[PDB]
Symmetry: D2
Subunit: 217 residues, 4 copies
């Protein structure tokens, strides 16, 4: 019973976007059984970033998803050893990102290590021109496969000139030792940028995230 009602975390990311290398370090905290967490990030290398912060924000904590008692909480059940997760983001104008992450627990602190590679973003598109204004709230479709947990999302970044910039997410959640899987279910999420300095070298985020069955079941 190592996951307490209040848990902190530390995170480090090493990333590249369109050839630009960067490193980010941060700290966060939250209420894993309530579905709330916050994180504060500093760009330690490669700042100011020449692309939109918004593509990085969902890579900084699903052990914090609230689950109903009848849905196995695969990510919480994976501790204390923890889990790895990986992701594809397919952007509608041809950008592609892959992400790989390790989640562990030491001394009561979650430790998150992230690597990120984004490629093929057009020079005049909204990522490289910094035209995005945050994510809409989203709904992930999850299911078990291959002994692990997978999920997909149709997400959207709001645009300064109006309209949306569409991104498909595909994620894989992989316990370090096999633990109990849920069935077909959904996770609702809303991620807010709650603070940032003028060139996004210091950034604060809040996420609400909760799992559930389809409403018609």
């Amino acid at each position: 019973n190592v996951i307490k009602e209040f848990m902190r975390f530390k995170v480090r990311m090493e990333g590249t976007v369109n050839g630009h290398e960067f490193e980010i370090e941060g700290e966060g905290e939250g209420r894993p059984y309530e579905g709330h967490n916050t994180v504060k990030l500093k760009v330690t290398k490669g700042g100011p970033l020449p692309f939109a912060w918004d593509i990085l924000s969902p890579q900084f904590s699903k052990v914090y998803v609230k689950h109903p008692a009848d849905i196995p909480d695969y990510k919480k059940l994976s501790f204390p050893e923890g889990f790895k997760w990986e992701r594809v983001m397919n952007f509608e104008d041809g950008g592609v990102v892959t992400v790989t992450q390790d989640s562990s627990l030491q001394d009561g602190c979650f430790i998150y290590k992230v690597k990120f590679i984004g490629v093929n973003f057009p020079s005049d598109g909204p990522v490289m021109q910094k035209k995005t204004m945050g994510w809409e709230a989203s709904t992930e479709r999850l299911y078990p496969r291959d002994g692990v947990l997978k999920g997909e999302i149709h997400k959207a970044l709001k645009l300064k000139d109006g309209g949306h910039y569409l991104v498909e997410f595909k994620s894989i959640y992989m316990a370090k030792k096999p633990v109990q899987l849920p069935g077909y279910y959904y996770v609702d999420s809303k991620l807010d940028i709650t603070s940032h300095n003028e060139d996004y070298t210091i950034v604060e985020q809040y996420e609400r995230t909760e799992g559930r069955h389809h409403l018609f079941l």
Copy 2:
């Protein structure tokens, strides 16, 4: 108004799958403000279908979606002229379908005409080996774009031997006269095959479908 609390519809489909031609005709009914409708289909040419009925079932009625008052009901507003809808289905083993449809109103009955082309299904896959057993309930992400309404879904067919077979839907809803569009929102659906003979030449379906904002808003 012109759309009554109870409305009947007639539908005809001409299609092809992996070089196999077929035609289907049917009749349905439902309650457009309550979010449900039913339909009875007969394969009138090309039966018995050498592929899974389930890939056809979502092409047989979104004027029937229940919408809250604060979300403009674009498809209902499009009548009496009505609307056209188009779709891509991307299957995880490479099958691809496009669909085009016309929806009109004639003497108090909705009239649906559907054209369907499905290609590249593997000979050994669940579609051509008839290994599927219905869709999970689903959730569509919709937004306005290009003066029309668009939406995407991550759907899944249950496999008879266990597991899921994954399908991405992208739809386009196009009113024949430009009427009020909604913002970013979601539609939940659940489609059930309620009757079928052994070779699926006579089939009946039931769908529940309703629009809503994201739960966290």
Copy 3:
């Protein structure tokens, strides 16, 4: 045997693009063992088309591909019964087309029947705004799979205001009577529009197309 060194063909297409229905009829001729053929097309219904002709031109004859003696010519061998072909076109701005075709033979005359559905073309993209100026020459990668022949191409339309508009082709060629398949090989093609009236309701085309092994073999 049945395929002479000069052969004529007739073709008919029923199609839809972004809700616009049309029909085209044509007549062609060529030298199947030499790798060239020509065709003249007339829009009989739905002209003038509200989109670029170029997306239709490659749907009007691969029995005319020149093959070296050591690569089985699947499509020629399929006659007199003939073959079916299907295809996906994935356009980089989200347009998707599927196509299904039947090829038959009547005394010296090939008979081509095509159905085409194209969806999700942006209103202001180069297809709906008629901004394309023909295809580059291309190179298809083919291989046997599932007892039929498949092939993929990275193609490109030239744009009037310079640059290219990218399209991926996936094709499936299915003989109506089992005949010998080749292994992994390539087909080079170049299709030219050689005449058109102002609104593209009358068009003539020339195609050169020849198969070969990879040059390093």
Copy 4:
């Protein structure tokens, strides 16, 4: 000038595939104006790798492509400063890789630094089951866009028990300074594994690669 008729290179890769971290160091040499080069790799962290080596082999040197004098050799022109390249690999069973690379020149040796993230490979697919046995020779379609050079390839791995495993490559070559771009053209390549130990912790490769116009031009 700086690119001599014979050139050596050193390479290091940091990668992750399905959660498995690894590092590889290597050394190569070749004839940049003739289109031939060889490389020798050793795994230095993470061996033996739990996946097919073949997905790594094309990430180890396009400055060695032979170009005819009439096609601008953008990568050679980029030196001595050099170029960066990025890549997406889309595998037919859902695996996705992104790659990012820096190419520089030091003490008369090219220096290559690669980062690689591979995700979503099925546990029973041919990559994680090590069921592949090298690439077919291939042909890349290249064009200028957005101030850089881009290319795509339909590639294929041979399967030990027969058949092929298909993979689409999208590459982006980004000179560190704005050196002249070519037009629409093709690059043929053939990569062979020439030596390896059983667990692929020691591997030797050879590549032939040459650029050209389409053959019909």
